[PDB]
Amino acid sequence: PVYADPSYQPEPQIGESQWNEADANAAGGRVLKKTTPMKP
């Protein structure tokens, strides 16, 4: 029962390994808080 270490996981450069992936029942990812200026 290991969870993602929030300080660096999930790592933005890691995703699914194949083009034909089955929709995930549960997914994760990082996101920038509203307090960080938006840039392209």
């Binding site: 390994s17 194949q18 083009w19 034909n20």
Partner: protein
């Protein structure tokens, strides 16, 4: 009524100048996962 027809056949499958850059798992058994295998060209090698 049939809308699509597929002429299925076996062929002498080869991959003489490429190798897999990604294989779902172990064993070369056909599966849905195998649809995502990735091929990569072999390294050039001039000999003379």
């Amino acid at each position: 009524k049939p809308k699509v027809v597929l002429y299925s056949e076996d062929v002498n499958m080869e991959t003489p100048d490429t190798h897999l850059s990604y294989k779902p798992g172990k064993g070369d058994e056909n599966s849905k996962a195998m649809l995502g295998q990735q091929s990569m060209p072999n390294r050039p090698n001039y000999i003379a």
